[PDB]
Scaffold this active site. Structure first.
Site, mmCIF file in Angstrom:
data_model
loop_
_atom_site.group_PDB
_atom_site.id
_atom_site.type_symbol
_atom_site.label_atom_id
_atom_site.label_comp_id
_atom_site.label_asym_id
_atom_site.label_seq_id
_atom_site.Cartn_x
_atom_site.Cartn_y
_atom_site.Cartn_z
ATOM 1 C CB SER A 138 33.910 21.342 -100.455
ATOM 2 O OG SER A 138 33.686 22.557 -99.742
ATOM 3 C CE1 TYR A 171 30.041 16.148 -101.392
ATOM 4 C CE2 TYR A 171 32.278 16.541 -102.170
ATOM 5 C CZ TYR A 171 31.231 16.822 -101.308
ATOM 6 O OH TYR A 171 31.394 17.784 -100.332
ATOM 7 C CB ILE A 184 22.754 28.549 -108.967
ATOM 8 C CG1 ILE A 184 21.301 28.410 -108.501
ATOM 9 C CG2 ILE A 184 22.779 29.038 -110.410
ATOM 10 C CD1 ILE A 184 20.639 29.745 -108.146
ATOM 11 C CD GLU A 188 27.279 22.339 -105.712
ATOM 12 O OE1 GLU A 188 28.397 21.928 -105.329
ATOM 13 O OE2 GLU A 188 26.246 22.257 -105.021
#
EC number: 2.3.2.22
Length: 222
Positions: free
Chosen positions: A25, A192, A170, A172
Site C-alpha cells: 500500500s 503482509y 470491503i 480488498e
C-alpha cells in the site's frame, strides 16, 4: 524475513512454496522503495511464482476519511499507486520475476470471481453485526497509522470516518479469502507485515464468509 501463518492449512500451502501474493500500500509507512525491493527479493528467493497486489481505487476513501477532498484523493491515489507499481516492476525485474504480475485490488471489478466474492463480503457486512464490526476495526486500522504519522494534531476517529473508509476493506477482502479464484493460480499466501485478526475469526467459521482452502495469510517481519 520471519513468517507466521493463520492456520495449519496455511502451513501446508507454505511448505509447497508455489505462489505468494505480496501486498503493498502506498499509504502504509512500511513501504519505502528500499523495503519493496527487499521484500520482493525475499519473495522471489522463497517462492516459485510471485505476484504483487497494490491498493485499488478505494484507497481514495482512506484519504477522504482523513479530510482530503474527493478529486484530490483520486489524484493522490493514482500518483502513489503508480509510483509503487514502478518500484515493484523494477524489483521483480531485478530478481528474475515478471513485472507484469502486478495488480491492484480494483482491477477485476467486472470479473465474475471477484464480483461473487464481493457479494459474499458485502452480504455479511450488512447482515451480520459481528462481521460489520470486524470490518470497521480493519477500516480504523487502515486510517489510524496515517492519521498519526502525517498530522500535527491528535484527530479523533469518528464513526463517520470509519463508514467512509470501510469501502476500502470491503474492496480488498476478496483477495484475503480467495485470491486464487481471481488470479487463476492453484493456491497462494497473501504476504503482509501486520497480523490479521479477522482472518483467524473467518477460519473458525464465525461469519457467513469463507476462507478458501487454497488461500492462506502469511505475516512477514524483518
Amino acid at each position: 524475513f520471519k513468517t507466521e501463518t493463520l492456520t495449519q492449512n496455511c502451513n501446508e500451502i507454505l511448505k509447497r512454496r508455489r505462489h505468494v501474493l505480496v501486498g503493498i500500500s502506498p499509504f502504509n509507512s512500511r513501504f519505502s522503495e528500499d523495503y519493496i525491493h527487499r521484500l520482493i527479493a525475499w519473495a522471489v528467493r522463497e517462492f516459485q511464482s510471485v505476484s504483487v497486489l497494490l491498493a485499488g481505487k478505494e484507497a481514495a476513501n482512506l484519504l477522504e476519511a482523513l479530510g482530503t477532498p474527493h478529486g484530490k484523493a483520486e489524484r493522490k491515489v493514482r500518483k502513489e499507486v503508480s509510483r509503487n507499481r514502478r518500484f515493484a516492476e523494477k524489483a521483480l525485474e531485478a530478481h528474475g520475476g515478471n513485472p507484469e504480475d502486478i495488480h491492484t485490488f480494483s482491477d477485476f471489478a467486472n470479473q465474475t470471481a471477484y464480483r461473487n466474492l464481493r457479494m459474499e463480503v458485502e452480504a455479511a457486512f450488512f447482515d451480520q453485526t459481528h462481521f460489520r464490526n470486524a470490518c470497521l476495526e480493519m477500516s480504523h486500522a487502515a486510517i489510524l497509522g496515517r492519521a498519526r504519522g502525517t498530522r500535527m494534531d491528535v484527530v479523533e476517529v469518528s464513526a463517520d470516518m470509519l463508514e467512509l473508509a470501510v469501502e476500502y476493506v470491503i474492496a480488498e477482502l476478496p483477495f484475503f479469502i480467495a485470491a486464487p479464484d481471481i488470479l487463476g493460480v492453484e493456491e497462494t499466501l497473501l504476504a503482509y507485515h501486520r497480523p490479521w485478526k479477522l482472518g483467524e475469526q473467518i477460519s473458525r467459521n464465525e461469519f457467513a464468509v469463507k476462507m478458501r482452502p487454497n488461500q492462506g495469510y502469511l505475516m512477514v517481519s524483518e
